[PDB]
Design an enzyme around this catalytic site. Structure first.
Site, PDB file in Angstrom:
ATOM      1  N   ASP A 180       0.818  -1.203   0.000  1.00 50.89           N
ATOM      2  CA  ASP A 180       0.000   0.000   0.000  1.00 50.89           C
ATOM      3  C   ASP A 180       0.854   1.256   0.000  1.00 50.89           C
ATOM      4  OD1 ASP A 180      -1.947   1.902   0.301  1.00 50.89           O
ATOM      5  OD2 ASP A 180      -2.410   1.405   2.397  1.00 50.89           O
TER       6      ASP A 180
ATOM      7  N   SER B 154      -0.784  15.540 -12.051  1.00 51.89           N
ATOM      8  CA  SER B 154      -1.031  15.174 -13.434  1.00 51.89           C
ATOM      9  C   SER B 154      -1.281  16.430 -14.256  1.00 51.89           C
ATOM     10  CB  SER B 154      -2.236  14.236 -13.515  1.00 51.89           C
ATOM     11  OG  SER B 154      -2.628  13.984 -14.854  1.00 51.89           O
TER      12      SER B 154
END
Length: 330
Positions: free
Chosen positions: A35, A199
């Site tokens: 994770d 992004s």
């Protein structure tokens, strides 16, 4: 040193991925959920409340000749999906794909929430976010990666998650045969303890690319792709009959649909998520309403590039002095 381990979807939907991890001496192999959005390595154990264990493999520290109780240490964690666990702490030898760390904090669960109990396939978590998020008290502990880093050939790990198929976590090297083209690297902020990056935009299907900054985290422990409501609405508007359902808890779509792809930007580069990656199947057994793999982050407080996004890429988690993230197509 290096390590390399195969990671395997837990079910037919790729809801999560498990990777075998050797703990203790002799080795006890547990299947952990790696994770990158948390920083605790915790396991089901011989100390876990019996009624809360249902099929998991447990770590038994008393059977490990290298286990030592970390005196006075406790831990307690709550995850974004509302699940939680807590307990005490041992140090022991932990190996992943041939890479060994001695003295790793292994957090032994005394209690786990129902979601964990109900998932027989996940024996614990192995956190790979920054150690500043580790919950051990009163002395915070380091992640497996943080402990291994100085010994690694290069201070990196990579996630290569499969779509409906096994993939690979590598430590200490970049497998240049595992991706196509080049890896595009992008800046990381560690201020919130995550692999947080921005992004450069998105496209829906064969549509034009929208240049827009989307701050979010690369999180292998989250199944879906959570993005701003505007972006998610633009995606689902291209699927006839798709709608946001408050009763179900997100966007649903007719299972008869063909889903468009979703592209996200990494600098000037583009990662394309095929439409099929966005299908999470019937909302309940036999239903013709299917759950979407792109959902709104509104009210999460952060955008999450979870498995839906990451599995479309070869992803480098670069733990150099100034960390960065790399993405390649594959």
């Amino acid at each position: 040193s290096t390590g390399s381990a195969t990671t395997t979807p837990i079910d037919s939907l790729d809801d999560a991925y498990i990777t075998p991890v050797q703990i203790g001496t002799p080795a006890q192999t547990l299947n952990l959920d790696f994770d990158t959005g948390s920083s605790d390595l915790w396991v089901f154990s011989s100390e876990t409340t019996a009624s809360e264990v249902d099929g998991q493999t447990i770590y038994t520290p008393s059977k490990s000749t290298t286990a030592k109780l970390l005196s006075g240490a406790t831990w307690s964690i709550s995850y974004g999906d509302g699940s939680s666990s807590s307990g005490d702490v041992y140090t022991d030898t932990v190996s992943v794909g041939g890479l060994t760390v001695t003295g790793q904090a292994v957090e032994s669960a005394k209690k786990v929430s129902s979601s964990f109990t109900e998932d027989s396939t996940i024996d614990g978590l192995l956190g790979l976010a920054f150690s500043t998020l580790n919950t051990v008290s009163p002395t915070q502990q380091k992640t497996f990666f943080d402990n291994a880093k100085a010994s690694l050939d290069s201070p990196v790990f990579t996630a290569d998650l499969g779509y409906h198929a096994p993939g690979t976590y590598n430590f200490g090297f970049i497998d240049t045969t595992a991706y196509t083209g080049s890896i595009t690297y992008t800046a990381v902020s560690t201020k919130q303890g995550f692999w947080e990056w921005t992004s450069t935009g998105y496209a829906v299907g064969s549509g034009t690319f929208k240049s827009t900054s989307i701050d979010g985290i690369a999180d292998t422990g989250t199944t879906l792709l959570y993005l701003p409501a505007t972006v998610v609405s633009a995606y689902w508007a291209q699927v006839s009959g798709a709608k946001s359902s408050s009763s179900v808890g997100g966007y649903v779509f007719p299972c008869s649909a063909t889903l468009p792809s979703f592209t996200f930007g990494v600098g000037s580069a583009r990662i394309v998520i095929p439409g099929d990656y966005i299908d999470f199947g019937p909302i309940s057994t036999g239903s013709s309403s299917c759950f979407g793999g792109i959902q709104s982050s509104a009210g999460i407080g952060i955008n999450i590039f979870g498995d839906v996004a990451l599995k479309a890429a070869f992803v480098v988690f670069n733990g150099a002095t100034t960390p960065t993230l790399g993405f390649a197509s594959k």
